[PDB]
Design an enzyme around this catalytic site. Sequence first.
Site, PDB file in Angstrom:
ATOM      1  CD  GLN B 127      -3.087   0.423  -0.265  1.00 19.25           C
ATOM      2  OE1 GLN B 127      -2.496   1.446  -0.621  1.00 19.25           O
ATOM      3  NE2 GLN B 127      -4.320   0.099  -0.656  1.00 19.25           N
ATOM      4  CG  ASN B 239     -22.637  -4.560  -2.825  1.00 28.34           C
ATOM      5  OD1 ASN B 239     -22.283  -3.615  -3.521  1.00 28.34           O
ATOM      6  ND2 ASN B 239     -22.076  -5.784  -2.857  1.00 28.34           N
ATOM      7  CB  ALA B 240     -21.508   0.962  -2.669  1.00 32.18           C
ATOM      8  CB  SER B 262     -10.487  -2.108  -1.167  1.00 38.28           C
ATOM      9  OG  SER B 262      -9.857  -1.320  -0.148  1.00 38.28           O
ATOM     10  CG  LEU B 271     -19.628  -8.134  -1.281  1.00 37.22           C
ATOM     11  CD1 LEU B 271     -18.955  -9.504  -1.162  1.00 37.22           C
ATOM     12  CD2 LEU B 271     -20.313  -7.802   0.029  1.00 37.22           C
ATOM     13  CE1 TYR B 319     -10.343  10.029   0.574  1.00 42.30           C
ATOM     14  CE2 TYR B 319     -10.150  12.019  -0.695  1.00 42.30           C
ATOM     15  CZ  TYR B 319      -9.875  11.328   0.454  1.00 42.30           C
ATOM     16  OH  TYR B 319      -9.115  11.957   1.436  1.00 42.30           O
ATOM     17  CB  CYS B 407      -0.656  18.708  11.929  1.00 40.99           C
ATOM     18  SG  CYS B 407      -0.859  20.490  12.081  1.00 40.99           S
TER      19      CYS B 407
HETATM   20  N1  LIG Z   1      -7.412   8.848  -2.847  1.00 39.53           N
HETATM   21  C1  LIG Z   1      -6.764   8.740  -1.706  1.00 39.53           C
HETATM   22  O1  LIG Z   1      -6.275   9.777  -1.208  1.00 39.53           O
HETATM   23  C2  LIG Z   1      -6.735   7.444  -1.196  1.00 39.53           C
HETATM   24  C3  LIG Z   1      -6.064   7.459   0.006  1.00 39.53           C
HETATM   25  C4  LIG Z   1      -6.092   6.283   0.631  1.00 39.53           C
HETATM   26  C5  LIG Z   1      -6.638   5.106   0.218  1.00 39.53           C
HETATM   27  N2  LIG Z   1      -7.243   5.075  -0.993  1.00 39.53           N
HETATM   28  C6  LIG Z   1      -7.866   3.896  -1.380  1.00 39.53           C
HETATM   29  O2  LIG Z   1      -9.079   3.933  -0.504  1.00 39.53           O
HETATM   30  C7  LIG Z   1      -9.677   2.627  -0.577  1.00 39.53           C
HETATM   31  C8  LIG Z   1     -10.106   2.232   0.822  1.00 39.53           C
HETATM   32  O3  LIG Z   1      -8.954   2.012   1.693  1.00 39.53           O
HETATM   33  P1  LIG Z   1      -9.212   1.269   3.063  1.00 39.53           P
HETATM   34  O4  LIG Z   1      -7.986   1.326   3.914  1.00 39.53           O
HETATM   35  O5  LIG Z   1     -10.507   1.789   3.674  1.00 39.53           O
HETATM   36  O6  LIG Z   1      -9.449  -0.226   2.514  1.00 39.53           O
HETATM   37  P2  LIG Z   1     -10.040  -1.527   3.280  1.00 39.53           P
HETATM   38  O7  LIG Z   1      -9.697  -2.668   2.387  1.00 39.53           O
HETATM   39  O8  LIG Z   1      -9.540  -1.520   4.734  1.00 39.53           O
HETATM   40  O9  LIG Z   1     -11.597  -1.293   3.320  1.00 39.53           O
HETATM   41  C9  LIG Z   1     -12.367  -1.424   2.129  1.00 39.53           C
HETATM   42  C10 LIG Z   1     -13.811  -1.484   2.659  1.00 39.53           C
HETATM   43  O10 LIG Z   1     -14.660  -1.482   1.498  1.00 39.53           O
HETATM   44  C11 LIG Z   1     -15.781  -2.321   1.845  1.00 39.53           C
HETATM   45  N3  LIG Z   1     -16.489  -2.723   0.631  1.00 39.53           N
HETATM   46  C12 LIG Z   1     -15.960  -3.441  -0.377  1.00 39.53           C
HETATM   47  N4  LIG Z   1     -16.838  -3.603  -1.358  1.00 39.53           N
HETATM   48  C13 LIG Z   1     -17.961  -2.954  -0.953  1.00 39.53           C
HETATM   49  C14 LIG Z   1     -19.210  -2.782  -1.571  1.00 39.53           C
HETATM   50  N5  LIG Z   1     -19.522  -3.252  -2.770  1.00 39.53           N
HETATM   51  N6  LIG Z   1     -20.138  -2.051  -0.835  1.00 39.53           N
HETATM   52  C15 LIG Z   1     -19.784  -1.531   0.406  1.00 39.53           C
HETATM   53  N7  LIG Z   1     -18.633  -1.691   1.000  1.00 39.53           N
HETATM   54  C16 LIG Z   1     -17.747  -2.411   0.291  1.00 39.53           C
HETATM   55  C17 LIG Z   1     -15.150  -3.481   2.599  1.00 39.53           C
HETATM   56  O11 LIG Z   1     -16.097  -4.190   3.340  1.00 39.53           O
HETATM   57  C18 LIG Z   1     -14.070  -2.767   3.426  1.00 39.53           C
HETATM   58  O12 LIG Z   1     -14.497  -2.494   4.758  1.00 39.53           O
HETATM   59  C19 LIG Z   1      -8.570   1.705  -1.145  1.00 39.53           C
HETATM   60  O13 LIG Z   1      -8.811   1.608  -2.561  1.00 39.53           O
HETATM   61  C20 LIG Z   1      -7.288   2.542  -0.943  1.00 39.53           C
HETATM   62  O14 LIG Z   1      -6.200   2.131  -1.749  1.00 39.53           O
HETATM   63  C21 LIG Z   1      -7.295   6.281  -1.685  1.00 39.53           C
HETATM   64  O1  LIG Z   2      -2.549   7.798   5.736  1.00 36.62           O
HETATM   65  C1  LIG Z   2      -2.109   6.645   5.552  1.00 36.62           C
HETATM   66  O2  LIG Z   2      -1.448   6.200   6.482  1.00 36.62           O
HETATM   67  C2  LIG Z   2      -2.264   5.872   4.407  1.00 36.62           C
HETATM   68  C3  LIG Z   2      -2.610   6.053   3.127  1.00 36.62           C
HETATM   69  C4  LIG Z   2      -2.654   5.778   1.805  1.00 36.62           C
HETATM   70  C5  LIG Z   2      -2.873   6.639   0.837  1.00 36.62           C
HETATM   71  N1  LIG Z   2      -3.232   5.976  -0.267  1.00 36.62           N
HETATM   72  C6  LIG Z   2      -3.185   4.659  -0.006  1.00 36.62           C
HETATM   73  N2  LIG Z   2      -2.799   4.576   1.242  1.00 36.62           N
END
Ligand SMILES: NC(=O)c1ccc[n+]([C@@H]2O[C@H](COP(=O)([O-])OP(=O)(O)OC[C@H]3O[C@@H](n4cnc5c(N)ncnc54)[C@H](O)[C@@H]3O)[C@@H](O)[C@H]2O)c1
Ligand SMILES: O=C(O)/C=C/c1c[nH]cn1
Lengths: 554, 553
Positions: B127, B239-240, B262, B271, B319, B407
């Site tokens: 990640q 489920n979204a 995710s 899912l 996002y 911060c």
């Molecule tokens: N753009 C950014 O700044 C940014 C930053 C961080 C993370 N991300 C991305 O954000 C996403 C989420 O990260 P995380 O740590 O929460 O991941 P995670 O794997 O801990 O959580 C993903 C959640 O999505 C839920 N989910 C999956 N399919 C679903 C569906 N169809 N309906 C509803 N819920 C569903 C799961 O149950 C799970 O709780 C990842 O793709 C990560 O890489 C983007």
């Molecule tokens: O804030 C964090 O620790 C992690 C974030 C990250 C950003 N994009 C995927 N993971």
Amino acid sequence: NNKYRDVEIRAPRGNKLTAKSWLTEAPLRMLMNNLDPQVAENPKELVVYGGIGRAARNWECYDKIVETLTRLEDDETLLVQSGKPVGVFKTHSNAPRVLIANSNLVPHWANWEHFNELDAKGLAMYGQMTAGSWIYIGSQGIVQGTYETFVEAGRQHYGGSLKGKWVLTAGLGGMGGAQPLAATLAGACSLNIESQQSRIDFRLETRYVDEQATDLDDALVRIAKYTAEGKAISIALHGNAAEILPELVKRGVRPDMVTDQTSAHDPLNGYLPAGWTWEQYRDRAQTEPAAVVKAAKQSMAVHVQAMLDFQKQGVPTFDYGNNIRQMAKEEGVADAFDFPGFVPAYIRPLFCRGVGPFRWAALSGEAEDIYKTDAKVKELIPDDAHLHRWLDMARERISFQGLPARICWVGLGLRAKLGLAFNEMVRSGELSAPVVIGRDHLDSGSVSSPNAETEAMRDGSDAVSDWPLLNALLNTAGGATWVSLHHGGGVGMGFSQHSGMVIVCDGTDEAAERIARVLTNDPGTGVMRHADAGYDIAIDCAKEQGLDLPMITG
Amino acid sequence: NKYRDVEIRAPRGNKLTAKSWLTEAPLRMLMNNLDPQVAENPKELVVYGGIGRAARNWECYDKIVETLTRLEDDETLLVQSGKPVGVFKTHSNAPRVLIANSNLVPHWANWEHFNELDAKGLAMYGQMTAGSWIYIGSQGIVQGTYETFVEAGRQHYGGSLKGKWVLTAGLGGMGGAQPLAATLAGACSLNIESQQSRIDFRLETRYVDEQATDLDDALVRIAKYTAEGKAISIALHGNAAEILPELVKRGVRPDMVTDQTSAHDPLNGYLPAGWTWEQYRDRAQTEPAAVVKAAKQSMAVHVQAMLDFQKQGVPTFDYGNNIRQMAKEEGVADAFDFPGFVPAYIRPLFCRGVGPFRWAALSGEAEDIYKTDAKVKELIPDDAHLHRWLDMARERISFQGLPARICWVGLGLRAKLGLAFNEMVRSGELSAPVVIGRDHLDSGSVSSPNAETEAMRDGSDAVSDWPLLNALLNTAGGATWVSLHHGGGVGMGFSQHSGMVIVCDGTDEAAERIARVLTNDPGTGVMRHADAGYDIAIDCAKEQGLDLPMITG
Ligand SMILES: NC(=O)c1ccc[n+]([C@@H]2O[C@H](COP(=O)([O-])OP(=O)(O)OC[C@H]3O[C@@H](n4cnc5c(N)ncnc54)[C@H](O)[C@@H]3O)[C@@H](O)[C@H]2O)c1
Ligand SMILES: O=C(O)/C=C/c1c[nH]cn1
Ligand SMILES: NC(=O)c1ccc[n+]([C@@H]2O[C@H](COP(=O)([O-])OP(=O)(O)OC[C@H]3O[C@@H](n4cnc5c(N)ncnc54)[C@H](O)[C@@H]3O)[C@@H](O)[C@H]2O)c1
Ligand SMILES: O=C(O)/C=C/c1c[nH]cn1
């Protein structure tokens, strides 16, 4: 930009500086040496070798790199981003003075079409391996590797020496031009197909090829004569490999080894379609690049089928790192990978001991500085007759291009011994000016390239590219003088990631401390990487050299 | 080797088990990444973000801990996709750990090849902060999610968001920050999540306020709370890919729509419509290609609902979970008709080097963070948005594992803060050293055309020289550990990015490192945006005295 300037650039010579110290004078000189008319393939367009491998993005960036290196302080570091001097930051005197990152693209966009979109916007430069990282020394950089490949193929297939045998290949560019001389040194005659007369002429002028045939029939007369006499003579033939190799198959001609080193890695710029002229090719690449790429790749498919046909006849056939099998496969030759890459076939056991294209250059410009280092290498490695013979052949048969330089393959343990000894020869005044120590990015710990240096890793880890990234991080931490991370050298966009390092031996105690760890760690990472893959010869080397490999030695 | 029925927590207080604070620090932050109060599934090494892991497997974990414990002050450990592969001599002003996780040669940079390597024991997904040991629970992302909602509010609604609501999904580690970020920005929110255990984790950590019983109940609560100007977050189990199309059909109009499932990893993180989580995880092992396909087909339906909200005038954005790309691959040709959050909202912050700057108290003592909060207010006395951030953090963000703080500050103030913190350690005002780090999402450390470098004004989105130079320079300047990762955020193929952490151990040597590293790390982001031609970045570079040869000479 502009990318054409009608100037002749050469490294400054002798012991007086333009920059503020030898640590900044060194990359200045090596950048200029990369463009020397006796070194580079097309330096008025900033092109060093390997298709459009360039030393700087365009001439505005060149001028600004020279200006900035001239004023750079000993605790400052210049960042070069695809050949452009983008920032100077405070570091310290034991960090690199230059950090270089060339041609890297996020993977889903890592292809020539996207590179070319960015280039048209002035946002790109192809670094190749040593073009953008300022450590190219003409055809000598690769010639020992190509010799070691031919020698090992000869040992596997023909009992060692290639006397009375001949190699068929193509491409007499900067790196390809080493093939004829490498074949000669291995004892073989060679037929070397090249589509541009000016490239044959450059290989003749630098004494990397011996003669030019008048036509295909005449070439085969000479090969028949010289092989019968047990001579080792290289012949150039002006023509197109994608026409001649299929014709040779049709005629039932049977070379003793077949490979290729055209610039197949870049279909738009490096590979002439059958029936075209280089002039047509360069012009049409500008109007109709998609159609040119398709025509080039279609001819690569014909060319690779000919290589496969020789192989079916029992001829040892291998790919020499220009991605031609991949291109042929994408054009429908589904069995293009039925012949292997040169590293899994021949060279990988050397990489397992950290042996690779270790090199150094005399910033003074003085031939005698390199001859003095050759003598020192023989004193420090007294019981390796193959290496002594290499240095004798280099002295007798390799003429310098630009700054005098030497290729000398050595591995983990001996690289540091040599570097410390050279540093002491600079300190004592035996050497008239500092020397730089570097390598190609083709080396045991510095490249991931599944169609070349990491093809067919025994554990399946061909595509893992953590290793070159760690190598560059570790060279930076240890104190190399400039460190580089490049994408796409050798095999083209999408197919490799790799790192470079150069360290200056300026005779100081500070440099000695950096050299001792950097020239241990740099080959050490390649022994580590091959030990991780499970090669017993790399694990043995790791133990012999006392490497600390926590998952293997604890 | 994959599963260990153990609870791991960082060592606390001032006793070392490693030979120095510079090697104790990565040891404690690795363990903190696996704390049960921090990580999503730490008994399988999973920290967040699909299968983002802290170490390749439990043998590798144990060997990293063992090796950090014995590492000398001039030695550097190399970590290769979560495996401790070599220890080499460097010097005390170099990083103690160099990390490279999940990097694949581009033609092979895809989940299918990753999974082939994983099955051979050759892979680990880092990640961003999972594999580089600087995750601090949901707090790491919450201020960036807040800044995104605040800027969307400024652009579309006059700032505050009182009376407005956000619709999104995903209450994982980072998605769990969305409800609280919306609340702090003034909005109500409806947060769809498929796993009750994830909803429970967000409830227990105070990141979401209430759980609705069904969609109709959820909408009754949203209507009531928004009418009253309350800022309450609602979780809905579901489920979204089913609920968002249902809300479009019902004519419901949220005030913002995004998503943080995710989606970046179809086999593990998303899912399919109609499946149970158990069915998904079972089938992932039995028929992975068919699972990927079903997940992506549901992402396509999900994204078409997002597009349908945008057609109704609803501000809609991606996002950083790559869902638009997945939907496009399944036939939603106009999936990129709605933008990513960085070009839409956040990029002007990155142009001044502002990003998810953070620090953690290795002592374990909450009061050490409260002292740093007070010091930031003293050092930055005239930024009331920042002071309000720290007040909201104190009030509403609970600590997870080692007390830590997010911060957002940029070029100039990062070094001021880190030098002050180092002086606090030296004086004993702080009871043990602090680590200073950031996400890999930061102005100079990531190339990601579907996220942080989407729609760069000069077309340079895919240029990934920049994060590689950032890591090289952090190594040259003396960060304590430096990382280069591939595929964080958006998944295999789609990003390259760098990490850094530096320890403030009170010493003069640390101060020298801190001053140049906390200048250079945001400096590379201002440089990168200046190179792209953003006048705000060029202005910042001139203010801050950066030496940018092609711009300043
Ligand atoms: N753009 C950014 O700044 C940014 C930053 C961080 C993370 N991300 C991305 O954000 C996403 C989420 O990260 P995380 O740590 O929460 O991941 P995670 O794997 O801990 O959580 C993903 C959640 O999505 C839920 N989910 C999956 N399919 C679903 C569906 N169809 N309906 C509803 N819920 C569903 C799961 O149950 C799970 O709780 C990842 O793709 C990560 O890489 C983007
Ligand atoms: O804030 C964090 O620790 C992690 C974030 C990250 C950003 N994009 C995927 N993971
Ligand atoms: N695996 C490795 O270790 C390795 C090492 C070095 C170089 N390379 C690769 O070797 C190749 C050659 O490098 P270079 O520096 O010589 O390149 P170059 O561009 O300087 O020269 C290529 C030569 O190929 C000739 N050519 C192209 N198409 C032809 C055709 N159809 N028939 C005959 N000649 C043709 C051109 O006229 C040119 O002289 C490149 O692909 C480079 O990336 C691989
Ligand atoms: O020896 C060199 O300088 C150049 C070599 C190289 C390796 N692969 C592509 N170029």
